[PDB]
Design a protein around this ligand. Sequence first.
Ligand SMILES: CCNc1cc(O)c2c(c1)/C=C/C[C@H](O)[C@H](O)C(=O)/C=C\[C@@H](C)[C@H](C)OC2=O
Lengths: 322, 109
Amino acid sequence: SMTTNVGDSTLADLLDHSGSGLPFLVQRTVARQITLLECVGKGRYGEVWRGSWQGENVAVKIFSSRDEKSWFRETELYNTVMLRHENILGFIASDMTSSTQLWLITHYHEMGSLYDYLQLTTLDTVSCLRIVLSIASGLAHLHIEIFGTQGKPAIAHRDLKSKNILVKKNGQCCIADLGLAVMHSQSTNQLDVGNNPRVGTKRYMAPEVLDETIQVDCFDSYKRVDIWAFGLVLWEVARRMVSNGIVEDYKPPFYDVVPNDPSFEDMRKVVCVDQQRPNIPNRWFSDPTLTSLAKLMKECWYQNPSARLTALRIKKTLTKID
Amino acid sequence: SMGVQVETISPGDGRTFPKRGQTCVVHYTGMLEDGKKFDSSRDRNKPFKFMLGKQEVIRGWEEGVAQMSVGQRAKLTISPDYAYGATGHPGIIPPHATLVFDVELLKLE
Ligand SMILES: CCNc1cc(O)c2c(c1)/C=C/C[C@H](O)[C@H](O)C(=O)/C=C\[C@@H](C)[C@H](C)OC2=O
């Protein structure tokens, strides 16, 4: 560019080797050099904007005043844990300005959210398996503690859903939004649940969350809540894979029994009182891939959380499917 | 001065001070008040640039560098309201932190 000077770095160079993103002091300067361009998300959390920095695309989440504790938690996690993985959204920077604006800056994924993607296209066996395997890989990476200096605590997400998964250009996905995450280390048995009053998306809440039997001081319990939600995402995706010229329309989990923006009670009645689960379309049982995915979904949806499989076992199972 | 104490480690040219709109090229090491280093351009061997007056850096860092001449190295002790204030920067800078920066003003552009 005409404004380029010898010594200028790209974002990749600035990210090249404490914390997941840019060097701390570089975070404010880059944030305050971004030009906002297009709104790509809006919700109760605030807004997400495509922006540009030195000719590179970035995504900028601008938090609502009601969700400031998610900004705090997510910034704290990415700054204290080296969280770089192909299937976890790449953090770049966090910044605040004095009301106050709170920004979280991440990699920009032009293909958008999985929720929107499933409404814009159908899938085949290659693209379906790639999506669900990549989500399992990201989730297993979160859940597994890595020891040593280049390690990471175990992490449970607590708000996994298709809107919190982004599609990359290569057709794999990455898991986003760590504002509700909880951390655990076996070295100390310390559980870090944070201070965020936010709760998970109601439609995706596991039975033990809806009936308040979840053991809130047990890290394992939060992993099993993620597994339930992953099973729902697996169902959403599988519906959009064509087999024998047939495909289901995109629908969110429990579309047929709860309204939009369901209440706690709406979900508790469906999931806990009535013990309902998403229906498996009959056409899946004529397809070996969808038959395998249906078996996997069911193993995420046991009422007894101890019966559910691990993220790693899901990943291994999906790696063996063709 | 207000919000930032400047202790000279080695002198600049005594004549060339940053003006509004100039780009300051610096090396820095940032530490908490207990000596814990949290960031250093020296460790990655890559000078850091910011434009004076653009509020691209915390107020104390900017107003400290504004008092330095080219070539000067100085220790800047920055009060919290001239740094990251009551919020801090989650996971890095605690609330109400006084910061210590070792800064060298390499050149102006
Ligand atoms: C056309 C490209 N559309 C796009 C491209 C993107 O890169 C993003 C987003 C959209 C965000 C969408 C909102 C999303 O559904 C959810 O609410 C959420 O907040 C998930 C991720 C956040 C943390 C990051 C900042 O979002 C993106 O990175």
